[PDB]
Ligand binder design. Structure first.
Ligand code: HEM
Ligand SMILES: [Mg+2]
Ligand SMILES: [Mg+2]
Length: 87
């Protein structure tokens, strides 16, 4: 619990603009505000899903091992349990 700060998806949803962009990937929240400019796939696809769980798009694109490593530096917390899928 403790080493983990939780975020309700309703809060994540509000970080959907260039000033502060967050995104959920496999139950974890990422502050990608500084990452936007450096994303090889470009900014637009990230703006389209900012504030939301983009796990499915992330996985369908087929990101590389180094892409997944890059996620870590932007990890800020976990999705609140109330917002998680039931199974
Ligand atoms: C809205 C979610 C995301 C979408 C739709 C997306 C989409 C894409 C697309 C379309 C490409 C180019 C495909 C190709 O290599 O031919 C790409 C490449 C890449 N993306 Fe994303 N991306 C997303 C999130 C992220 C995140 C969170 C990171 C990590 C911080 C990331 C890191 C990369 C990197 C490093 C590449 C270069 C190719 C690779 O290493 O796999 N992307 N992305
Ligand atoms: Mg704040
Ligand atoms: Mg590695």
């Amino acid at each position: 619990d403790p080493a983990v700060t939780y975020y309700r998806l309703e809060e994540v949803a509000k970080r959907n603009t260039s000033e502060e962009t967050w995104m959920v990937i496999h139950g974890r929240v990422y502050d990608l505000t500084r990452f936007l400019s450096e994303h090889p796939g470009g900014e637009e696809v990230l703006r389209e899903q900012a504030g939301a769980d983009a796990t499915e798009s992330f996985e369908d694109v087929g990101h590389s091992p180094d892409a997944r490593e890059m996620l870590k530096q932007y990890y800020i917390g976990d999705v609140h349990p109330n917002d998680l899928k039931p199974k």
